Design a protein around this ligand. Sequence first.
Ligand code: LPX
Ligand code: MYR
Ligand code: MYR
Ligand code: MYR
Length: 582
Amino acid sequence: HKSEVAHRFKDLGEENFKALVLIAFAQYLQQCPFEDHVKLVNEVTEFAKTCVADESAENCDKSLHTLFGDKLCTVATLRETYGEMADCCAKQEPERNECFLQHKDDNPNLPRLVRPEVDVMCTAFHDNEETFLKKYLYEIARRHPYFYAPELLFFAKRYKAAFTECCQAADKAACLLPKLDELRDEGKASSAKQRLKCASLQKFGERAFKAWAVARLSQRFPKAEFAEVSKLVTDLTKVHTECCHGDLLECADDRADLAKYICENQDSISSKLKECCEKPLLEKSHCIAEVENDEMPADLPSLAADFVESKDVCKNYAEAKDVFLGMFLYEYARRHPDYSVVLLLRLAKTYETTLEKCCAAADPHECYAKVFDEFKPLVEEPQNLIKQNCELFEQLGEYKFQNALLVRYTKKVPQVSTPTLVEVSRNLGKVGSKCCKHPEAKRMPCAEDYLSVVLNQLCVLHEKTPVSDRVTKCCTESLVNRRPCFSALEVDETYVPKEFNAETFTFHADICTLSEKERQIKKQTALVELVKHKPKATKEQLKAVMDDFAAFVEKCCKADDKETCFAEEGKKLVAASQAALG
Ligand SMILES: CCCCCCCCCCCCCCCC(=O)OC[C@H](O)COP(=O)(O)OCCN
Ligand SMILES: CCCCCCCCCCCCCC(=O)O
Ligand SMILES: CCCCCCCCCCCCCC(=O)O
Ligand SMILES: CCCCCCCCCCCCCC(=O)O
């Protein structure tokens, strides 16, 4: 429902409601000063209370969309600030909302948000928590207009845990900054993931999306029957599709509905969901989405019977090609939660290709009798990659490992700028750090998931400023070859090595007052300019120059002077190196 606003107020709570109204408005009106959206949020909140007291009350019968757009159209400066979005107001609902939806700016071109010093922040926090927290909720929201709002609220609450804990600890910066650094990471990864969820849907289409989802849901709910996994992916895809159009209210209802359906049918889905079905609306769906894998049914048969030995394989396949392949993929996925989703799609795509050849022939059982042999190599290639890389990592350590990567890729694609090489190799390094600590079981899902963050940003940066056809190839290619494409880059032996330049390999005393990290980005940048300039540098020729530079600093920051050792012994490093790397 009779009143939809009353119903969200009741269901969300007051604080949560005030929060999501702020985020809603911050994401359309991305230029009205904070101390001004607050006026709005209180006005919308005051109205909500009246509708809650009496659901007959004026304007309460209206739809969320209508109230929301009606409110957008009240702001005095709309036409001067936002220009042709004010043009949307001269329409009726539903068109008016489609019009508003289509005029959000993804790059609102604001100044970078600058983290104040820890003590400034903590003083601000204590002196007024509500205001400190909302001002920041406003600053993220208008920079990330497409970030599903309930997710922002969840980070919001984690920023508030980090402050309360750390702003009364012995050493606050030691407490606070890693927490803030992990939040930046996670915040950014999630933002990356959503834009890649949609992009994939638009380029590669719905069937590919469903394939991905069947794999993922079958690893997560491996006691569910194929019929229920399939029902869940049908609705799972409908919601992503709706959540990509970009309309918060519609997207949120579908998510609500799905969590609703999942909790009613727990018995038929998974035993690991009782914890999250007792949670309140706002959180239910976020939770289910991060739910841990249910233990798999004990002692299932192999697939051989249904997918190889059976005599009904071409008949079943021909009758409904995509339900069959989807069942193969369901029976595979639930058996192996230790596989990355993309491995499964590669396996499933291979089983597909042989059936098209082998069903088209006239001894089909004979032709495709050996199809499981082909899975072995594809399964083992990711496994080894993880093995060689996690045995390298634990014997070099994060930083040195980051540096093993830096020279590997600079030699492979030496036309990528030095900053992009530094950032990808540093993050790749961190993915190594993060998934090697896992047992072998949960490693591959781990790495798939962090690589796709690290490699998508690669493409996005390279998208606008491209300097390699091979990188471009790996980026536009299929989502099941993004990774192996890159893994196939060889050394660029056409490379014309960069001319020398004194400036880059000059260093000063400030480097000693640089922070652990800051110093590393510096050291690592020189390392890329060194490989660009001497690509044919044997590892050991480079190992020894890195050890010359290593002494050149320490035995020079620990010396009784100066600049000068920096100028005059740096003079003697450049000369020596040029000679030994020749
Ligand atoms: C569902 C996409 C990937 C999730 C991986 C595993 C799925 C597990 C199955 C539980 C179903 C999920 C329950 C509700 C549906 C659900 O959580 O997602 C619905 C759409 O992804 C909407 O995306 P958006 O709202 O922008 O994402 C929020 C996080 N950034
Ligand atoms: C429940 C039916 C959903 C569709 C399942 C069909 C699976 C298609 C197998 C081929 C894999 C292609 C991989 C891809 O497109 O990235
Ligand atoms: C650079 C991080 C250290 C170890 C991880 C290397 C990644 C190799 C496996 C990629 C996992 C995704 C599965 C796949 O592409 O099939
Ligand atoms: C041809 C001029 C050579 C001088 C430039 C040397 C650049 C090497 C960067 C050192 C990275 C090592 C990091 C470390 O081990 O702490």
